[PDB]
Amino acid sequence: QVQLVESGGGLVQAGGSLRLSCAASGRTFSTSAMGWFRQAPGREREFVAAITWTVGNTIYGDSMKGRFTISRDRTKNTVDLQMDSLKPEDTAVYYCTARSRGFVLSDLRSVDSFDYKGQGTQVTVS
């Protein structure tokens, strides 16, 4: 199996930036894509971003394209989420995910399409 460890959360003023990072370990040979989703208390999961593993194609949730950039390093088995122009409605726990199943790209917009998920890191915007 695969294990995911997120970091880089904190408390930042509106308009500022943060950068989340995730280290993957385990059976990373099988990874076909990685991504991020978020969950605010009381609300349901929303898709944030995904990146295809071999070529590095990226897709975004509607309120984040432009402000956020997902990237990944295959030799280090990491994936980062740069977050610019943060807003109070971005306040949530952010989870990194991985998939081993192949896919057509639109499958990845579905928030529950992952095979593994991390432990989560808190982001608060004031």
Binding site: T52, T54, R101, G102, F103, V104, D107
Partner: protein, 226 residues
Amino acid sequence: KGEELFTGVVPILVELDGDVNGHKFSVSGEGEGDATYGKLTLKFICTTGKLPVPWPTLVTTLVQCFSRYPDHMKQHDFFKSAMPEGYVQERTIFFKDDGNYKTRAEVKFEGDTLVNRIELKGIDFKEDGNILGHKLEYNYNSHNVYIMADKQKNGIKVNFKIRHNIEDGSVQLADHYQQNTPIGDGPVLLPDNHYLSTQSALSKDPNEKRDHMVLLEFVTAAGITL
């Protein structure tokens, strides 16, 4: 369902990380597959320098989902039924009177591209044999690839022998033992016994200075007789 992903021309990426007798190397490839004609067109490059084994020994390791299955046999096409989630492909390859390769690969779609990612380990090869001695002709022969269902592992079992022509007129046999299992848990097609008629032609690009191989393949399923 997965068959619908193969109706036109599909781009392909291949990546191989290898180690033979302690010699590490990497290969990458790119091209196109057209399952309605059963046709592959690909170019491979050794990204770490010179390839420590002959290019023909890597052909079978370097995407049988592009085989043409005629209409009367579409229910026997395991490879396409596992898409887009994909399948694991594992082999042991015994080179008679010499070492062996062991390989593990996953074949799957990453959006519009069919990707074959491979790990290869070779052991017990003779330093002056046909493989490490580079005594193989740069060519390939036609072979029948025999396929049967593996109900207990919900996949297929595959075996065949490859004939590699040697420069001195003899041949080197490579005995292939193969297993495929789906990555997802969706329904898959388990075939009746049949075979793949496989043909491969190797070439070179005179513009390419890196160690490389240009490869064309034609593959058609058979053995049911309408």
